Amino acid sequence: LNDYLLYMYNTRVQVNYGPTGEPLDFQIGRNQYDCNVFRADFATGTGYNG
Amino acid sequence: QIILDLKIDPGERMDPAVRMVAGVVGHLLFTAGGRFTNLTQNMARQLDIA
């Protein structure tokens, strides 16, 4: 999912990277949508169904 | 009811002359005013860059 998001075949939009090097750890777009919620966390199921 | 967008085919986009001619023509050919639009935002940005 990180590779799909970061690969752009159109005009590039701005992206702000976070401190850690974990995947999906960035904010993308003009309105700064946070993508940290899509990383897997089995305690609450943050990124998947449920 | 109908809008239009540019193709993603490589090749002809890297050609400078076609890109410049299209960028000059599109500002006179289409309408993106305050009442209705014919173009998507991405195509308008591409024509502005051209």
Side-chain angles (χ1 to χ4, degrees), chain A residues 5-6 12 18 21 26 30-32 38-39 49:
Chain A
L5 279 182
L6 281 193
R12 282 172 56 181
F26 56 90
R30 204 171 61 280
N31 61 6
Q32 265 176 257
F38 275 98
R39 190 159 62 251
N49 285 327

Side-chain angles (χ1 to χ4, degrees), chain A:
Chain A
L1 179 63
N2 175 87
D3 277 351
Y4 181 80
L5 279 182
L6 281 193
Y7 174 74
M8 295 179 184
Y9 43 91
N10 277 301
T11 310
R12 282 172 56 181
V13 309
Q14 65 148 309
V15 63
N16 291 307
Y17 287 110
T20 71
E22 301 266 40
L24 293 174
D25 200 308
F26 56 90
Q27 310 177 110
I28 181 177
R30 204 171 61 280
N31 61 6
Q32 265 176 257
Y33 191 90
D34 188 20
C35 308
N36 278 330
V37 298
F38 275 98
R39 190 159 62 251
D41 191 5
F42 276 41
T44 59
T46 316
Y48 297 79
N49 285 327

Side-chain angles (χ1 to χ4, degrees), chain B residues 2 9 11 15 26-27 30 34 41-42 46:
Chain B
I2 302 182
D9 189 358
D15 186 35
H27 286 79
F30 292 120
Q41 296 194 56
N42 183 253
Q46 287 190 275

Side-chain angles (χ1 to χ4, degrees), chain B:
Chain B
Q1 303 156 72
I2 302 182
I3 53 187
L4 72 164
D5 191 323
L6 289 164
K7 276 191 176 189
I8 74 179
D9 189 358
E12 65 183 1
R13 184 191 320 201
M14 294 182 286
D15 186 35
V18 167
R19 205 156 62 84
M20 291 184 265
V21 165
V24 169
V25 161
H27 286 79
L28 302 179
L29 192 43
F30 292 120
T31 294
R35 274 71 71 211
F36 56 90
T37 179
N38 300 134
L39 311 193
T40 54
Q41 296 194 56
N42 183 253
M43 174 174 180
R45 174 62 92 169
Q46 287 190 275
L47 271 67
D48 295 348
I49 292 166

